[PDB]
Design an enzyme around this catalytic site. Structure first.
Site, PDB file in Angstrom:
ATOM      1  N   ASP C  49       0.829  -1.199   0.000  1.00 21.86           N
ATOM      2  CA  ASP C  49       0.000   0.000   0.000  1.00 21.86           C
ATOM      3  C   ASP C  49       0.866   1.253   0.000  1.00 21.86           C
ATOM      4  OD1 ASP C  49      -2.250  -1.633   0.103  1.00 21.86           O
ATOM      5  OD2 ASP C  49      -2.260  -1.654   2.299  1.00 21.86           O
ATOM      6  N   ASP C 383      -8.265  -0.237   2.881  1.00 19.53           N
ATOM      7  CA  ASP C 383      -8.263   0.209   1.496  1.00 19.53           C
ATOM      8  C   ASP C 383      -9.378  -0.429   0.689  1.00 19.53           C
ATOM      9  OD1 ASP C 383      -6.115   1.910   1.823  1.00 19.53           O
ATOM     10  OD2 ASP C 383      -4.644   0.344   1.387  1.00 19.53           O
TER      11      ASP C 383
END
Lengths: 514, 510, 513
Positions: C49, C383
């Protein structure tokens, strides 16, 4: 010592950068002059793509090969060798980025090929069949000379250039092996340059005005000794026997008066009168008491002639060499229509024109007898080699970047070989074409981006071959400017660039050997 | 350089800076070399001999450089010197400060071709207005004063202190006799130093002046045929041989008897063939001498390399040593042969006068040759200054007053045009300015005191500086209206040849 | 101080940001790689990420401070594509380097960037299409959007879990989740296992041998600061002003333990019938074992160790009144849950509150004892929850995986941004910076990255069809039929953030320390 995976390619392309960078301002009228004092340790003024390679003491092996490759181009074109240097490092720049992205050089080399023949297809499309009229020959000769020298010097020289190549059309010759004799006149200004249809003899016959105006010249190009060296030998050189050496002396003085009497029988044999002239070109010096006696007979007798003039006078005028002056018919000798003794400098320079056969035309430049006289020597030489290509082809094209963006429009937008492997090499190929118009205008002050967007639009607008004005920096149409390239010249620079680009790209080791 | 190749001595720094820097240093000694001088330049040579001089052509030939930009321009300074006289001091100092101004345009970001063509437009326009700045002419070259009026500037360009006596004396030694209608001696004007009789006692002697002492009596006729020989007469001394000091002295006496009768017949055969004067580049034999007095033939005891070659040119003779009885192949030309006591020295004087074939030779008398060989350098360019090959030489303001007269025109012309050549025309008017700025710093004041006035006076032609107080504080010196003149032609080439050199050396990067 | 005022000052700036991008070039893909990250005290973290790798730990770069600012706003507005925004500007410096390497103005490159975005923002309207609020439409987006951010096996276990969480709204218009975000970590035998349960999960349940387990119509009495005081919702200290004042407090405290369990059990007789309806006590703090006897024998599911964060979503989950007291304030101060159930798996007891008045708070029960998994499987959640919520907030989703990148670059054909060619400059480095997402994947895959990229362009020019690059082969394929679709909220925001900072880099030609 060995050169491995990345370094062997890297030294080749990095050397091609600074070779292209130093040789940037050498093409076109924006092309600046260059000097070498590191090639021979002498004050040298030099401009050509090939000649600058041959003089510099280069040790990088790539530039040594290009000096061999551009030699084959310089044998045909002349100028255009400095055109070839610019496109090589630009071609190596784009493909290296793909290798910097990570790519085989051979798939780009595979893409170098089909990109080329589309441009070769485009050269037949973009060739412009013009006449080989003198003013059309002037525009080729203007841009060739202004590349190397000033334009004020060019236009005076351009008058002398375009008339000799029309004289070689009388011999129906598309090429130039003769009429290329560059003769140099002692002057202080190189602003003057004379064109003589026949030859120029560089001497003046110690007792002058023997016959300075000869309307009927029967030429004898010989090297007869009249100041004969008289030696007494018994060993091949001077020996100690004083008894032996004395008997040879009485025959030594009989040789000089022998050659004086032979001139008198030859004048009555050829001419029969003094109304018809007779010219003796002696490669050696003549007795001045003979130059007094020959002057009264109706003979001019030029002396100490150059040995380079000895063959060329036989070719156009005629006259063979002897050591006697025996009775010869005018069939055995050649002819000149007009002989005039001209004087400039400390030497007399006898003009000899309108030959038995006007086969060689003498290009007589004046000058301050400097390297400037040398700099105008090879400039008109490459001026003649450029218009040599003009008599070769039928298609004289507006150059200076007019074809360059016109190729790259068709190459990028239209994939010739729509398979993506070869179009990668097309992208490096079409971006190689941009280097000639973009940076010379950028040198002129209008930078490379203003020049490209103008000439790409205008040519796509008109179809008229807009080139680049190298004296403003903006694109102007080369058809009216008179900056033109031949169909013979533009093919070879495309040919010579590609073959020498691929082989140095396809190396991986440069090993010390021998 | 990134690779093994590319041998070169110029580049991004070196072409922009170091080529101009090399031309700066050669022009650094010529800051005060034209016009009024307090500057002097001592040189020890490749001969390693002490000399001081103010002619750059003597200095620059002693100077050596590997910079071709610095090497090329001194040839163009010779090309002005081959054509006209003095002003060869100007060619380097004008083009030197010219190129320094070109660096500043390269500091801004101007293209070199914009700088190349910029002075070229300025070179043409200045050559247009320059014959409009002709203020006088040599209307009477037979006049001594009009000739001396031109010469005072070129002698000042070697030394201000001797400009007035020599300019008269050269006209007294008659460059005036040439009509200049294709008439100018280049070697029958050759300056003859006579040691002693110090430098203000330098004199006039027309026709060929030979310092060598006249041996024997004078010629039989002044119309004599001149025989010029390389070494006809000898002098005997020897040393120990292969076996030391040969076995007898009889053959020494036998060789000595034929030696006298040899040189008896040598002076006899010259007397038979018509020549009544012999020139000996070798020494004089005693046995040759006492027959030459009875034969009434004049003899020169010894001659150098320069003595024979002027005689082979002017008289038209052939120089060769006669180990044979000599015959006439020399064709004596001068109809007047004199002996004169110049510097109390027996001086051989040859003389003839023609319309465009005359001879008139500079002679100098001074107590020191090392002074007088530099005084003749003030004479050397001054005689060639008469070679304009015209009677009316189109006289312009002398001293350098034409430079500020030109610089007003050129920066006005530079303002009117557009372009990036526009700036180099304005910098070209600055190139006239640098020379009187460098001369006023030898005068004794700053440049801005001086150069403010010469721009503020107006188009005048007269206002300039010398080396006086009028040069210093008011900066006004009549370098046009006080016997100070220059010609058009010397000014025309020195601007032209400095331009073509500086444009040439600017394009190169290798 | 010292100054650096040259083109080299820009050249050091553009050099630092490209190398930091190439570190992150390892990420962004199912064929892209997780990046191991270790804290200062040491903690193994495997994240692909962007924001977590950027904002937490980094090395000394002035560009690192710059890219942290713009990836913040990408994380602020969207919360997705924090991987994707870095790769554009790295290439965007790279081709723009070449023209100033040739020698051009930094501002003439800057102005072509703005026209590059405006020609592409109007193209963003063209390339997206109206997609549905279907679950299965969001299945294709979620599993695609997870693989660009996290691993594919992480995407497979979460594809069913993420789409059903965001679907519980009643057309609530928000681009990210707020109350659906609830992560309950759990020590399991399986590191990778994921359970979505509607309603809120309690972090710690409770058990007495008389305590019930399944209750229906569970009237929640939300509870807090405990039996020892009375009528308190916050803790307090003891009186130290006198020695007898310390003693008189704690002698009364055991009486308040008696009094407050008395109020709870007498409310159970009143409201819940006798024991006919479920009753649930949710205490924030510890339960005294005397009241653990008295509550559980009544039939009350009492609970232990709640968080005050859990108290606030419990007010939403019950939908009624969630208190903080034990005493009888009013019988209508009880929220209603039709089903409350405590399921015990592993070491920990997990209490669910279901039959929610608001389907706004769901909770992913997160398995895995090992922290490096338990960090990573938690990182895939946050996310995932925001990105698919962007897809359901947008009525139009862009088809992604690089198919727009060749589509705009061909549509950015020049002489249309022709004013002086300076606009043609900034669009040209822009079009080459578009292609990095097809460049990164075929780098990570086979089918060499630019060799097939021009083959994407050769096919996309044919019939105008959108063709993308395969995530597992690098081969060309149509992005629509395969369904490799990126979030348009990412893609629309991507043009804005990448334009402004590369503008700001060209405005920086001086650096001072």
């Amino acid at each position: 010592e060995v050169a491995r995976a990345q370094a062997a390619l890297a030294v080749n392309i990095s050397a091609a950068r600074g070779l292209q960078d130093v040789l940037r301002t050498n093409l076109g009228p924006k092309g600046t002059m260059k000097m070498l004092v590191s090639g021979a340790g002498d004050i040298k003024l030099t401009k050509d793509g090939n000649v600058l390679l041959h003089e510099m003491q280069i040790q990088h092996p790539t530039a040594s090969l290009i000096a061999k490759v551009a030699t084959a181009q310089d044998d045909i074109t002349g100028d255009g060798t400095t055109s070839n240097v610019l496109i090589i490092g630009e071609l190596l720049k784009q493909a290296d980025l793909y290798i910097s992205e990570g790519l085989h050089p051979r798939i780009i080399t595979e893409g170098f090929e089909a990109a080329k023949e589309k441009a070769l297809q485009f050269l037949e499309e973009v060739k412009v069949s013009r006449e080989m009229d003198r003013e059309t020959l002037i525009d080729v000769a203007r841009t060739s000379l202004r590349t190397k020298v000033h334009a004020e010097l060019a236009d005076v020289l351009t008058e002398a250039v375009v008339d000799s190549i029309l004289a070689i059309k009388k011999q129906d010759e598309p090429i130039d092996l003769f009429m290329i004799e560059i003769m140099e006149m002692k002057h202080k200004s190189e602003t003057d340059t004379s064109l003589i249809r026949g030859l120029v003899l560089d001497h003046g016959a110690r007792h002058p005005d023997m016959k300075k105006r000869v309307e009927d010249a029967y030429i004898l190009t010989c090297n007869v000794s009249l100041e004969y060296e008289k030696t007494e030998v018994n060993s091949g050189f001077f020996y100690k026997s004083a008894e032996e050496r004395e008997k040879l002396v009485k025959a030594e003085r009989k040789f000089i008066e022998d050659r004086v009497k032979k001139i008198i029988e030859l004048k009555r044999k050829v001419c029969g009168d003094s109304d018809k002239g007779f010219v003796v070109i002696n490669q050696k010096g003549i007795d001045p008491f003979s130059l007094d006696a020959l002057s009264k007979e109706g003979i001019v007798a030029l002396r100490r002639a150059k040995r380079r003039n000895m063959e060329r006078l036989t070719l156009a005028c005629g006259g063979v060499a002897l050591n006697s002056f025996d009775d010869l018919s005018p069939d055995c000798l050649g002819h000149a229509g007009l002989v005039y003794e001209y004087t400039l400098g400390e030497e007399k320079f006898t003009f000899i024109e309108k030959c038995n056969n006007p086969r060689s035309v003498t290009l007589l430049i004046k000058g301050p007898n400097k390297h400037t006289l040398t700099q105008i020597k090879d400039a008109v030489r490459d001026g003649l080699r450029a218009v040599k290509n003009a008599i070769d082809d039928g298609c004289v094209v507006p150059g200076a970047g007019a074809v360059e963006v016109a190729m790259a429009e068709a190459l990028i937008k239209h994939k010739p070989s729509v398979k993506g492997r070869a179009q990668l090499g097309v992208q490096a190929f079409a971006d190689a074409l941009l280097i000639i118009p973009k940076v010379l205008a950028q040198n002129s002050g209008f930078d490379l981006q203003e020049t490209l967007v103008k000439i790409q639009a205008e040519h796509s607008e008109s179809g008229q071959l807009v080139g680049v004005d190298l004296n403003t920096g903006e694109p102007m149409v080369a058809a009216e400017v008179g900056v033109w390239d031949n169909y013979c010249v533009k093919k070879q620079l495309l040919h010579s660039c590609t073959v020498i680009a691929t082989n140095i790209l396809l190396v991986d080791e440069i090993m010390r050997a021998g | 350089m990134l690779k093994e190749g590319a041998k070169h001595f110029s580049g991004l720094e070196e072409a922009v800076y170091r080529n101009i820097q090399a031309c700066k240093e050669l022009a650094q000694t010529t800051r005060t070399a034209y016009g009024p001088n307090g500057m002097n330049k001592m040189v020890i040579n490749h001969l390693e001999k002490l000399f001081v001089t103010n002619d750059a052509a003597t200095i620059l030939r002693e100077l050596e450089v590997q910079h071709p930009a610095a090497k090329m321009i001194v040839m163009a300074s010779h090309m002005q010197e081959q054509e006209v006289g003095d002003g060869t001091n100007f060619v380097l100092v004008f083009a030197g400060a010219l190129l320094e101004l070109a660096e500043e345009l390269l500091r801004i970001g101007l293209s070199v071709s914009e700088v190349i063509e910029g002075y070229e437009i300025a070179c043409r326009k200045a050559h247009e207005i320059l014959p409009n700045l002709v203020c006088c002419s040599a209307k009477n070259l037979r006049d001594i004063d009009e000739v001396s009026s031109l010469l005072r500037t070129s002698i000042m360009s070697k030394q201000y202190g001797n400009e007035v006596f020599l300019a008269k004396l050269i006209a007294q030694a008659c460059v005036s006799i040439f009509p200049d209608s294709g008439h100018f001696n280049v070697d029958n004007i050759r300056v003859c130093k006579i040691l002693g009789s110090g430098i203000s006692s330098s004199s006039v002697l027309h026709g060929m002046v030979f310092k060598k002492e006249t041996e024997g009596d004078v010629t039989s006729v002044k119309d004599a045929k001149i025989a010029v020989y390389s070494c006809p007469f000898d002098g005997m001394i020897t040393e120990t041989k292969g076996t030391v000091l040969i076995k007898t002295a009889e053959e020494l006496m036998n060789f000595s008897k034929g030696e006298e009768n040899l040189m008896d017949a040598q002076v006899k055969a010259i007397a038979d063939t018509g020549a009544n004067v012999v020139v000996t580049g070798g020494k004089v034999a005693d046995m040759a001498l006492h027959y030459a007095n009875k034969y009434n033939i004049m003899l020169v005891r010894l001659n150098s390399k320069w003595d024979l070659r002027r005689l082979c040119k002017t008289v038209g003779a052939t120089a060769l040593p006669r180990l044979t009885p000599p015959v006439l192949e020399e064709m004596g030309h001068c109809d007047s042969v004199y002996l004169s006591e110049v510097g109390d020295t027996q001086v051989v004087v040859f003389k003839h006068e023609k319309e465009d074939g005359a001879i008139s030779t500079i002679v100098l008398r001074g107590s020191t040759d090392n002074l007088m060989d530099d005084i003749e350098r003030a004479v050397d360019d001054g005689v060639n200054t008469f070679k304009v090959l015209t009677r009316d030489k189109r006289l312009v303001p002398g001293g350098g007053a034409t430079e500020i007269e030109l610089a007003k025109q050129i920066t006005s012309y530079g303002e009117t045009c557009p372009g990036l050549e526009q700036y180099a025309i304005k910098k070209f008017a600055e190139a006239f300015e640098a020379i009187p700025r460098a001369l006023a710093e030898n005068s004794g004041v700053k440049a801005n005191e001086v150069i403010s006035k010469l721009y503020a006076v107006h188009q005048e032609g007269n206002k300039n500086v010398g080396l006086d107080i009028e040069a210093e504080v008011p900066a006004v010196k009549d370098m046009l209206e006080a016997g100070i003149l220059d010609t058009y032609l010397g000014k025309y080439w020195a601007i032209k040849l400095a331009t073509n050199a500086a444009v040439t050396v600017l394009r190169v990067d290798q």
